[PDB]
Amino acid sequence: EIDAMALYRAWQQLDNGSCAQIRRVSEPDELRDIPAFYRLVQPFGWENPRHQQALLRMVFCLSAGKNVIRHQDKKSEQTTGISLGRALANSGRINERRIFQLIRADRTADMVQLRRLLTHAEPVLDWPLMARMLTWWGKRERQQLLEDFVLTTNKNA
Amino acid sequence: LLIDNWIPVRPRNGGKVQIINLQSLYCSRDQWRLSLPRDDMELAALALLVCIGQIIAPAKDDVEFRHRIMNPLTEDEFQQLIAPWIDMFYLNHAEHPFMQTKGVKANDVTPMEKLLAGVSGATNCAFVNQPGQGEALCGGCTAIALFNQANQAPGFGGGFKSGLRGGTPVTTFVRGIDLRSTVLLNVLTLPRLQKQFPNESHTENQPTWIKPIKSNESIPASSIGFVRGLFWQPAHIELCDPIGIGKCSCCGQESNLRYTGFLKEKFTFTVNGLWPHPHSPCLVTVKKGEVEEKFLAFTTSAPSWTQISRVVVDKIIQNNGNRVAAVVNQFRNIAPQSPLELIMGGYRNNQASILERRHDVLMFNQGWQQYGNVINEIVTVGLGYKTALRKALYTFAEGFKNKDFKGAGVSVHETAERHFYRQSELLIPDVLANVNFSQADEVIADLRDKLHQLCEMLFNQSVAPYAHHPKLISTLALARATLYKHLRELKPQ
Amino acid sequence: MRSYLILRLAGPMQAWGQPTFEGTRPTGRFPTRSGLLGLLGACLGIQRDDTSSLQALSESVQFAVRCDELILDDRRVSVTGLRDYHTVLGAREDYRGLKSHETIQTWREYLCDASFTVALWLTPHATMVISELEKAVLKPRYTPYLGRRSCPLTHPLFLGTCQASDPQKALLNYEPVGGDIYSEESVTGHHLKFTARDEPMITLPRQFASREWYVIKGG
Amino acid sequence: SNFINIHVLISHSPSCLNRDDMNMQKDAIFGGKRRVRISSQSLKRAMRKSGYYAQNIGESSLRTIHLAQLRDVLRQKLGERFDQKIIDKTLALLSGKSVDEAEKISADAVTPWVVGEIAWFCEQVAKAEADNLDDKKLLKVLKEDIAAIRVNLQQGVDIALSGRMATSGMMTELGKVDGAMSIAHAITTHQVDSDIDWFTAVDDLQEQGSAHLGTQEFSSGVFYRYANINLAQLQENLGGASREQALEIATHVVHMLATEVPGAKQRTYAAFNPADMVMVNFSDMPLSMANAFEKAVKAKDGFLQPSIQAFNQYWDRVANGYGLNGAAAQFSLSDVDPITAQVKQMPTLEQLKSWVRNNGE
Amino acid sequence: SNFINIHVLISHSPSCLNRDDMNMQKDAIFGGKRRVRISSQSLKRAMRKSGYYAQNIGESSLRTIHLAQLRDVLRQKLGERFDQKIIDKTLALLSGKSVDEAEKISADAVTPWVVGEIAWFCEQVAKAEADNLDDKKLLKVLKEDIAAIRVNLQQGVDIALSGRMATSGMMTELGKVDGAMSIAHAITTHQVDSDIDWFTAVDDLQESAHLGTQEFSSGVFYRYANINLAQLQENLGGASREQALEIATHVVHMLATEVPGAKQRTYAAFNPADMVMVNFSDMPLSMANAFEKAVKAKDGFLQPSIQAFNQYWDRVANGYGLNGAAAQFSLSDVPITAQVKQMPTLEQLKSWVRNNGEA
Ligand SMILES: [Zn+2]
């Protein structure tokens, strides 16, 4: 089936002991190595396994911090969730070529570039949009990220 | 022409081509429709027929109009009374002869290719076209060439002139089930006839061949008159000696006499332009200042539906509005509650050289007489969605100077317009053929939705190969923005 | 009942003519009679000079064209146009001499990605039988192309042979159904005409005369 | 079998081998996806105007047609339209040499664009005999056209293989010469992503000032070339003439498609790449394998391998079902999983040419 | 054989050898994978303006559309030998543009002017002054012998190699040069992802400045070049082949050693080439498709690149049975089964080239 937002909450409420283990990781396949991860993800979850890549990416992104990624519900007026490009653009901390490099990145490199971007950004966004794009992470999603960023940064000017 | 027996036709349901005199056409129940190898010449033919029919038989009452349509306008005697005119000879008389001038024989000689519009206009013609269409020509196949050249074609430049509507003027004719009905349906009732060219007192009703063009620099103008204008042929050419019994190069048929050349010379004159032609619409433009009147001509490669509004919708200044052709204007008054079947054709030109030729049959259902505003709407819609795509891709290519975005830059709008136009040709004429004008704006909405989807898809398609470079993925953000900024102003309803 | 020969036209690009004397050379959404006649003409080996066999072929056979919209990975691929910009070095300022321009330019419209299924049957006044055409279409003696030499075939002309009463009933036997249809016959309960100048005027080259298709729609 | 099918898969380094009026790469939409394209006209010009073509078809033994050697047949075929002395007047006019007995044929076989062309001359000298302009006077008028046919009477193979040059000065329906080789548009087997070279023009005198800005579009692709030869037509238009000679001519086309590239922007870019795969196949009917690539070929380790694979796989299932029963042979620089035992694998191009020369035996 | 093929594998430390309009690295997509690229047009210029070019080939051509500046320059250098008005008429004939003052005159597009030919043309115009034949007549006379004009081209060799094209004046009739060198854009043998240098400018007086980016990347580049010797002979005035090969060797040397100078102050990628192969052939061939399958690292990209190049070369040579004169120069000889000659040093390779595939 599909992965809930309950993962986000579960990440929020888990103890610092485990979270320190997960936060302490350079790349996602290294996330695969440690136990607290399997313990975290067992419900959602391992071993479908069609989900596993998505879960590695999602947890790896969440791993940035307790409140690095903040979840904001779609406003009734907008009826669209604020999305990662818009968020990174909104924060104002992020420089666009570091996103261009994100678009250019490949496999393990892309997530690592990304995790680095959020911590510096401390973004607010609709978590399942990030989940949805992270689940596929096709070229279309990559491109949409940049489009969103440029457009909102231009609107914000 | 009347006695001459020159007209080529085929019966409606099944046929072998036959050659005819104006008499049997006007006096018959048989359903005939025109038949030639080329459509532009068919249009020229029918324009000739409508011109002469208009000249000989223009009169009230509207009842007579309808009656002439449904019941043939002559027992032989009734028509035979109708032709006093003996201007249609090109037997030839030394005095008149032939819808062109005589004398002024200035060798050397020129083949008949030049009068057939399409061929030998340009270089690619010599390359891409079949040879030997100009060897031999006939009474009909030639007369049609001459009229067509005088009115609907712009040849030959170089101190020659094209009159009177202009060069590349477009025609608009109402069509009926049979040639007979058709030729009449575009004739102007004596009062409708009287309204447009009544002034009369400075009349000349004498053709260029009966009475000649007044030499040079004249001026006078606006006193052309009912007849002398419609058969105005300024080519100033003496058609060469006829020959032979053999096939027309293009009539395709055996003929008793044939023509293998013509003789030409330079004639100059100039006229103040306000001459009201029943056959074509004209467009009224104001700047600054003094008004600008000229006749509709095809200017671009665009689909014909784009022109529709100009063809069947009258307008008044200063909105700046067009004026529809008189024949159409008449037809709408005489038979409301009847659908139109318009036929329109014309050329695209540079100098001698013909670039595109369009001949069309356009369909409308009932309401077009009343609230043809709806008709104007669909055109402006279809164009409104086009210009959105074009502007978006122009921005994608040239780019936004501020705030410092760099553009692609390749010309993508140009190739996308063609796709749009091609796929639009399917959807816009087709609806406009079948709309219940009375209560049909949901149809327009589904149209806007389809055009919307088309613009989205073409925009994405045209940009797709270049959008792998963040350099340009940034520009298409703004470009896509302009696209939807443009698309939003159109759709909601 | 009626004997049919069923053929398929399957290039990655196609060109089917429309009226022109200028450099710009357009196309339509489906084949033309002159095209199909020329196509079998090629398959049968008919040279351009002998009016006899041409006229014979034209009188002998009548066609029906079904448009096959393309499906791959269950997504419909609608037909599309090209405009090839097409120059020539040389040539032929005149039909007679050895004199030429440096460059003439021409524009040429093409069709992608289009497939057609086509049924042909014998006229009453036929000068041949369907089996000759079968034999000729399976083993051509001149190169079959659609409808410029630039564009080759990706599926053989021969698709099959049938017995049926109407061409529709004949086309239904063959696989991609639901396409729009253009016939010279007849058909009961269907009204609409479509006009085209694709009837080759065989007596006079190289020009064409007006004809009409009966239009049919499955859904 | 009458038809020879040549399929080539050739990959190209970044370049712009063919352009539209607006300096953009020619493209085509196939399988619903954009493909970069090289027009047939460009390929054919590249072939026709190549040195190899000039060497092997310009300098071919069958290039000269001797009119003295066709007196018998020309009289035979034109006896019905003209009178023998008019024919003789024409041939004597064209060759400028009368009536000597030539022990050679009299081939009983005559290319139709020649009888077609000379017939027109017979028509002219006939009514010229009517008028009557004496031969010296008329020679003056037909001076261009005679030269025009005389040059054509020396390019038999060239005209037969590739079709008239025009301008060839030929004036009859039979003189519209086509074939014998049909050349397809070359389209990429995969959807392409296009690179825009954003260049500049530096002035030595105003060197430290803003520059001259220009854009050129390039792209690298794996192109599928298809070509076709109608042997019967080649013999007919050429001879005569024996099959073996026609096959000898075919091998040259096979070589050229494998090696020849259009010269567009080859100075500034240099896509001088040789064909990575070539198949030759004999058939009753011409077929192109473009539908192997209808589903756009996606990269695993470049486009070339998966393209070869796709082609191979398509050929395997499709070929038998269609008219392609026999006989076909393939030249590859390398792959595993060759397409099937059915086709002979050829180590070199020369061996393939030889295979073709011996009628695919 | 008429065609000489030059193949170079050159590796570069982190640099930015050529730039986009957005000061981004020039790139190209090959085998579906991104590659860093160096324009041919840039390489050619790097060659023309090189020190080595001045040392061994001579005067680089003067490309500008500023005719007003060129009036003065030509008057300065040709003033002692000619009269200024004659110079003026000569230029006016050559560019089609009128030369007076007119502070700013300008040309259709940037054209390569060599001074020697202009001097020669001035002499022709002096001989034109005697008759005086109307300019068209003089042109009719000068169209007859192009080679004479081309002999003057032994100064300005770069034009002979890369060619010039005229739209305006008499350079359209006399000045059209084609060939003789074909040069590819230089592309990496492997896939690249480009490193972003995030630099700052420190304000000494108030030392919180902010951020600028320069995109760099290190790569192993494959350069290809081609010379049509016959065409070069034609372009130089019929010059002997023996002379043409020397120029070719100079081109080989430059192609092996010269690097574009863009950003070389801040990034000093002054590396020579780890491989150079030269081969004579009837037809031009490029080995780019050896790298269509982007080369994956074993011990750097260079090693597998050399290997790939050699294997592809073997396949092509055997498949197309190219019997050719071929010679290879490597720094890392580590080995081809192919019957191609190994040269220990560049100078020996050059000598091999000078002596027409000497064995
Ligand atoms: Zn006629």
**Sign, Cα dihedral of E271, E220, D219, D315:** positive
Measured CA to CA, the distance from residue E107 to residue E225 in angstroms comes to 31
Measured CA to CA, the distance from residue B116 to residue D48 in angstroms comes to 36
Query: Could you tell me the residue range of the domain that residue B261 belongs to?
Result: 1-371
CB B96 within 8 A of CB B87: yes
What is the whole-number distance in angstroms between the Cα of residue B249 and the centre of ligand 1? 6
Report chain breaks in chain E, C–N > 2.5 Å, as residues after which they occur: 207, 334
- What is the Cβ-side half-sphere exposure of residue C73, based on CA atoms within 13 angstroms? 5
* CB neighbourhood size of E102 (10 A): 12
Query: Could you tell me the residue range of the domain that residue A98 belongs to?
Result: 1-156
Query: Could you tell me the residue range of the domain that residue E53 belongs to?
Result: 1-359
Q: What is the count of structural domains for chain B? A: 2
Residue from E19, E22, E36, E215 to probe the interface with B (highest B Cβ count within 10 Å): E22
CA dist E75 → D201, D206, E79, E82, E171 (Å): 25, 18, 5, 8, 20
Contact state of B408 with D192 under an 8 Å Cβ cutoff: no
Q: Which residues contact residue B50 at a Cβ distance below 8 angstroms, ignoring those fewer than 6 apart? A: B173, B183, B186, B187, B279, B327
DSSP state of D15: B
What is the whole-number distance in angstroms between the Cα of residue B141 and the centre of ligand 1? 4
Residue B244 shares a structural domain with residue B334:
yes
List, in sequence order, every beta strand (DSSP E) within E33-144: 33-38, 62-66, 106-113
Of D356, D112, D141, nearest to D253 by C-alpha is D356
Of D41, D159, D175, nearest to C88 by C-alpha is D41
> Which of B371, B390, B425 lies at the terminal end of a domain, its last residue?
B371
Domain C1-218 carries which CATH code?
Answer: 3.30.70.2660
Written as six digits, the tokens of E221 are 């580049």
Measured CA to CA, the distance from residue D55 to residue D58 in angstroms comes to 6
Q: What is the resolution in angstroms?
A: 3.2
Written as six digits, the tokens of E246 are 């020397």
Q: Give the domain CATH number at A9.
A: 1.10.520.40
3-class DSSP state for residue B388? helix
For B470, the closest of A146, A151, A157 (CB atoms) is: A146
- The distance from CA D355 to its chain's CA centroid, rounded to whole angstroms, is 20
DSSP state of C119: E
| B250, closest residue in chain C (CA to CA) | C204
Of E315, E342, E347, nearest to E330 by C-alpha is E342
CB E37 within 8 A of CB E26: yes
Measured CA to CA, the distance from residue E238 to residue E230 in angstroms comes to 9
Contact flag for C and A (3+ C-beta pairs < 8 Å): no
Measured CA to CA, the distance from residue B42 to residue C207 in angstroms comes to 14
Residue from C44, C54, C84 to probe the interface with D (highest D Cβ count within 10 Å): C84
Written as six digits, the tokens of C117 are 């299924």
Residue B383 shares a structural domain with residue B367:
no
CB A51 within 8 A of CB A3: yes
CA dist C183 → A136, B130, B455, C3, C159 (Å): 48, 29, 33, 16, 18
Query: A105 to chain E: which residues are within 8 Å by CB?
Result: 193
Burial class (CB in 10 A: 0-12, 13-18, 19+), D209: exposed
Measured CA to CA, the distance from residue B481 to residue B470 in angstroms comes to 17
* CB neighbourhood size of B406 (10 A): 17
CB E296 within 8 A of CB E190: yes
3-class DSSP state for residue B78? helix
Contact state of E24 with B406 under an 8 Å Cβ cutoff: no
DSSP state of D241: -
Whether C93 and chain B come into contact, CB under 8 Å, resolves to yes
Tell me the β-bridge partners of E341.
E327
- What is the Cβ-side half-sphere exposure of residue E57, based on CA atoms within 13 angstroms? 29
Measured CA to CA, the distance from residue C35 to residue C41 in angstroms comes to 9
Tell me the β-bridge partners of C181.
C66, C216
3-class DSSP state for residue B384? helix
Q: What is the DSSP string of B434-452?
A: S--GGG-SHHHHHHHHHHH
C-alpha triplet C17, C20, C21: angle, nearest 5°: 140
CA dist C4 → C44, C129, C136, C171, C218 (Å): 18, 11, 15, 9, 20
Tell me the β-bridge partners of E5.
E226, E279
Chains that touch C (3 or more CB pairs under 8 A): B, D
Experimental technique behind these coordinates: X-ray
C-alpha triplet B331, B335, B337: angle, nearest 5°: 125
Q: Which residues contact residue E115 at a Cβ distance below 8 angstroms, ignoring those fewer than 6 apart? A: E59, E62, E74, E77, E78, E155
What is the whole-number distance in angstroms between the Cα of residue B242 and the centre of ligand 1? 13
**Sign, Cα dihedral of E293, E296, E302, E308:** negative
**Sign, Cα dihedral of D60, D62, D67, D68:** positive
Q: Which of residues 203-222 of E touch D (CB under 8 A)?
A: none
CA dist D231 → C136, D29, D253 (Å): 17, 32, 12
Tell me the β-bridge partners of E106.
E66
Contact state of B118 with C104 under an 8 Å Cβ cutoff: no
Measured CA to CA, the distance from residue E298 to residue E305 in angstroms comes to 10
Q: What is the DSSP string of D126-177?
A: HHHHHHT--HHHHHHHTHHHHHHHHHHTT-HHHHHHH---S-S---SGGG--
CB D276 within 8 A of CB D9: yes
Pairing verdict, β D344-346 and D328-332 = parallel
List, in sequence order, every beta strand (DSSP E) within B133-229: 171-174
Q: How many CB pairs under 8 A join B and E?
A: 8
**How far apart are the two ends of chain D, measured CA to CA in Å?**
12
Written as six digits, the tokens of E238 are 């019929």
What is the whole-number distance in angstroms between the Cα of residue B134 and the centre of ligand 1? 10
Of A155, A154, A153, nearest to A93 by C-alpha is A153
Contact state of B470 with A151 under an 8 Å Cβ cutoff: no
Q: What is the count of structural domains for chain E? A: 1
Measured CA to CA, the distance from residue E142 to residue B182 in angstroms comes to 68
Element housing B9 (H / E) = strand B7-11
Residue B340 shares a structural domain with residue B230:
yes
The one-letter amino acid at E13:
S
Of D324, D322, D354, nearest to D342 by C-alpha is D324
Phi, psi of E200 (to 5 degrees): -125, 155
Measured CA to CA, the distance from residue E229 to residue B26 in angstroms comes to 80
Chains that touch D (3 or more CB pairs under 8 A): B, C, E
Measured CA to CA, the distance from residue B359 to residue B300 in angstroms comes to 14
Query: A97 to chain B: which residues are within 8 Å by CB?
Result: 470
**Sign, Cα dihedral of E311, E312, E313, E317:** positive
The one-letter amino acid at B410:
V
| E38, closest residue in chain D (CA to CA) | D197
Q: Which residues contact residue C81 at a Cβ distance below 8 angstroms, ignoring those fewer than 6 apart? A: B418, B419, B422, C27, C109, C110, C111, C112
* Domain boundaries of chain C, sorted by first residue: 1-218
Of C164, C217, C165, C219, nearest to C191 by C-alpha is C217
CB B271 within 8 A of CB B221: yes
Pairing verdict, β E326-330 and E341-343 = parallel
* Percent of chain E that is helix, strand, coil (3-state, to 5): 40, 20, 40
What is the whole-number distance in angstroms between the Cα of residue B252 and the centre of ligand 1? 6
Do you find a cis peptide bond into D106, omega within 30 degrees of 0?
yes
Measured CA to CA, the distance from residue A114 to residue A116 in angstroms comes to 5
Virtual CA dihedral for D72, D76, D82, D86, nearest 10 degrees?
10
Show the DSSP H helices in chain D as ranges: 40-48, 51-53, 71-78, 84-95, 112-131, 135-141, 143-152, 156-162, 231-238, 243-259, 304-321, 349-357
CB B483 within 8 A of CB B389: yes
- What is the Cβ-side half-sphere exposure of residue D229, based on CA atoms within 13 angstroms? 26
Of D356, D357, D307, nearest to D332 by C-alpha is D307
